[PDB]
Amino acid sequence: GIDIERHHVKKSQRSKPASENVYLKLLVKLYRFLARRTDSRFNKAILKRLFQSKTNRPPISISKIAALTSRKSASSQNKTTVVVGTVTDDERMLTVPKLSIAALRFTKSARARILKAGGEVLTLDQLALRAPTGSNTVLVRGKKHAREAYRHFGFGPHKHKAPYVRSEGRKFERARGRRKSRAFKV
């Protein structure tokens, strides 16, 4: 008899992608070797983000990449941008700067605009040749909580989260508990 808090404690981690994509598994197999044969935190983080799921890999945008790489001091220069996820176009920006992005997927609009205006689009394996240790690479992430679910998570009294309502209007969770004229506001 031993006084141990908990036995056989796996914490939370994913060891392989739940995806059955053959090419994703090929990239994972590459970055398994790269992570464990190099001391690169970059390679380890790329391997972990390849394991991650769709909600944990939000899409990044052309303009967001341009915004992050053009931040006054920055010194982003010609350093390649790396995102483990999809790069979506932003129609609102009318001129796309010369950019270098390595990503799992580029939308057809985003890939066309990047190639038409300046730089190049790379896959994560081609990045593994140019920068096998991830040197001079700007690793970026999408906004995880821009997802609609987080607009509802944590709903409660005085939390200012969106309720799950079937329609929007004056008849739909707007009277009692939502204003002082009907009893209380909560």
Binding site: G1, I2, D3, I4
Partner: protein, 214 residues
């Protein structure tokens, strides 16, 4: 080829001379206490010996029906299992910890033989959170080498004399997993040592018990 053997040959003798110095220190301290006691007897006065700074605690009770405070303290002592032993630096904070869990553990003053055979026969290190036995001096050097603890004898000296790095040495040592005492306990095991039991403080009597479990 021979460059390595020469360099380690030098390192091994550094270990040997420090072990020789430590043993000389043990002998000198033992002699000094004896002579000081002899002087007190001859002159008719009384010599109060140095109170022990080192304590060995054995968990004698199992893991059932324990109050939360005693259960917390024994967890802090790393006494998770019955017949588990630990070396403790004895001070005011430790004294009132052992006071609370006195019905559940026994403790006393370890001698040189007790410390030596505990680390030799039941010596396991906490190497990358794993219970790795102390079968080579490289294991101890790879963990405690930043404190100039290079050998088993260096670890024994740090434990026995309560050196400046006693916390690191004690936490490096895995909680000793002692067997049941050969010959048994007393008739009633969960009284105090004073009232005929085997729980509580027992001073120099912890050495006979440890030699029963080794």
């Amino acid at each position: 080829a021979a460059e390595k053997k020469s360099a380690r040959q030098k390192k091994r003798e550094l270990i040997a001379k420090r072990a020789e110095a430590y043993e000389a220190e043990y002998r000198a301290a033992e002699r000094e206490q004896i002579e000081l006691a002899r002087k007190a007897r001859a002159e008719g006065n009384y010599f109060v010996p140095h109170e022990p700074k080192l304590i060995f605690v054995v968990r004698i009770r199992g893991i059932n029906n324990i109050p939360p405070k005693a259960r917390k303290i024994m967890q802090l002592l790393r006494l998770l299992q019955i017949n588990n032993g630990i070396f403790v630096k004895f001070n005011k904070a430790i004294k009132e910890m052992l006071q609370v869990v006195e019905p559940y553990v026994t403790y006393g003053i370890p001698n040189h033989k007790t410390v030596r055979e505990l680390i030799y026969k039941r010596g396991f290190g906490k190497v990358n959170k794993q219970r790795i036995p102390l079968s080579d001096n490289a294991i101890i050097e790879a963990a405690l080498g930043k404190y100039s603890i290079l050998s088993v004898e260096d670890l024994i000296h740090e434990i026995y004399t309560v050196g400046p790095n006693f916390k690191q040495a004690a936490n490096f040592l895995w909680p000793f997993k002692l067997s049941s005492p050969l010959g048994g306990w007393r008739e009633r095991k969960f009284k105090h040592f004073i009232e005929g039991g085997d729980a509580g403080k027992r001073d120099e009597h912890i050495n006979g018990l440890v030699q029963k479990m080794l």
